[model samples]
Target: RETSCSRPRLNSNLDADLYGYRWARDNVGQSGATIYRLYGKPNAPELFLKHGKGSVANDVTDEMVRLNWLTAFMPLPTIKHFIRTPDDAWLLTTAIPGKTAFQVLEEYPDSGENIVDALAVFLRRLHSIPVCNCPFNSDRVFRLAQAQSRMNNGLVDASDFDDERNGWPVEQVWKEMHKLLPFSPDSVVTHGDFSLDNLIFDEGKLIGCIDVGRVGIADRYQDLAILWNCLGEFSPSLQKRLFQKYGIDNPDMNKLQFHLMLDEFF
Candidate 1:
């Protein structure tokens, strides 16, 4: 059951340097995880290796744990292996099928209902997971405390903030986090970075999901902030269509505002 030149096992704990495996590195994946793809025998399931470092390394660890907890119960990726080297955390997994939703859209250009409808299905499917025993917590109080702790230590990075809030000094960011302290969230397990670019779709169906470090029980608004933030590439009508597909007939602008501001700490 072997090819003459094929090696059966990866020799090292790293992706790029694995023995006998060929990788093409476009490097850092969307959402900051570094990614490399392994080439194997023709038709072998694709392999993806990911690494995260610096202050972001813990996100890799978080994803590892969440994948372990969620993979068995869902269609998400399974972490075949992971390890840490001082400042780095690496994740290796069998690559998933299908193109990202945005990838699918980009290829078709004229594709609409199918792409938008698939997203709503994927969102509902993940949110439908049982949350009674979820391991990670993103409840309002926990998140507010988290936001505060991040702000107090001068950790909030506003470089990517909206023009109005961008370049603000850390002190102002902290003050804003406190002013919006009490939040009321209709809790659900959110995909944290809810965007078309983050989901994989095949024939209008969700084949896999990735970049889920903060996927936990939280305000559905947490995801709305991100969705709204990223969906600016599309038209206002397309945006409204997405919400309508998601059943948000009367969207909560106030809560979305709170979550958008709350993202400063995240």
Candidate 2:
């Protein structure tokens, strides 16, 4: 059976400790990477260490690249230490302030209205970035190839599908994916994984975002679709207010579904 003991551990060749920081495991994120919260002594800043396999696409090294590139334009954690070997990669970044959106919601359930707005505004800001200025490309073709690759690699989890596609075979889902492709996507720089858990909030406002390995040029709906689905998990009808704030007068259900379908392989 699957267990923590079966999971990969940090290689002894890599130093898990920073020069003057003490570390503790951070169990917030769901990625394959193992995260550690490193607390420094007085006068030093807190940091996060992410370690994962290089064989996995979009691992810590990819995140380090994205963070380094996006920090100039967005409120992202700064990369402090980065090291890579043939088998593994490590990324150490300075800690950003504020709790994740999930944490905020857990502590302040009454802030749903503000939370929706905050979510909307941050996405809009990210989508507003000029695509010409972005270096990475995660548009449909790139993402589709990625999806196909993951499927071919036997990495997709068919049992984890959403209700609508639940119990469907991987081939059936792949066939459905081809049918839902959007013709002309509204392109923008997207926070590839725009889930609430990745967003940081404080004082009822968006302070920053993390786990940004996928931040790049892509269809605007990529972010919209992911965020919409995430909201549905909390409140099935909350996306209406979210779109109202996001300035989308006519939300294209087809585009949303297309993006959501593509996310399954990843």
Candidate 3:
């Protein structure tokens, strides 16, 4: 029955591992993938599957490869299985338990300050990981080139620009991005997308991080820039606490501006 979409038909035996599980499709992420949270027989589902079309930017494959390597060093989801074809790929991974920091804040408003501290500490730990010999590199040169490609390919959406850049032409955003260039980075194994929704917290403590497809060797400020903007979305005061707990007495505003602008391309 699945053959219609340029994919081979999946049979019962081929999908036995997926059997008897109730699942809900997720509306999260812009990775061009379908995500499903699966609940197993006795309840308390521990697995999620992300399906994506094969392409140069196939995020599931990137995620699967990164998770296989990073799992040894951090609290990330474990890959259970992976199936890749020329047309598409499916990645099955064990779910990390706990509410996201964003969820915690919404459900328990009193926990705001505490979760911000936890997020800062968790990000510090992630950055402290040794980057020597890491296969993936998300450094400035590579990222900026990617940004250029996305722009050339007409992949950037001007309508989605941040409020400050709202109504600016794509070319203007591209130009501004270039002016902020020549960033000198403090290299580290950064979480690439260190937003509140990506960090998992349980009982006021950070336990795991998710959506790590972008994890790689990059500037520590890449994570910090993203998190700073995210925290400011909730409350600007909370942004100060993030840098405080992260131990940066004086955060580099230029690097933050550069990296935050860099992120809009992706």
> Best lDDT goes to which candidate?
3
Please report how far candidate 3 places residue 45 from its true position, in Å: 3.4
Q: What tens digits encode model 3's per-residue C-alpha lDDT throughout 115-135?
A: 888888788878888888478
| Model 3, runs deviating above 4 Å | 1-14
Q: Give the clash count for each candidate.
A: 0, 0, 0
Q: Against the unseen true structure, what C-alpha lDDT does each candidate score?
A: 0.73, 0.82, 0.83
Judged by TM-score, which candidate is best?
3
Model 1 clash count equals: 0
RMSD of each: 6.9, 8.8, 6.0
Residue pairs of candidate 3 with colliding backbone atoms = none
Candidate 3 lDDT for residue 249:
92
- Per-residue lDDT tens digits of candidate 1, residues 1-266? 97578558857555344556677775565447788887764656677777788756777887888878877656787677899778998888777778987788778767756677667766777777777757778776777787787777666666867665878876676576567656464777777777777788877677888777777888877776676665556666666666788888987767766777777776
Model 2 quality (TM-score): 0.88
Q: Per-residue CA lDDT of candidate 2, range 161-227, in tens?
A: 8789998887788898898765785678988999878999877678999899888898888888888
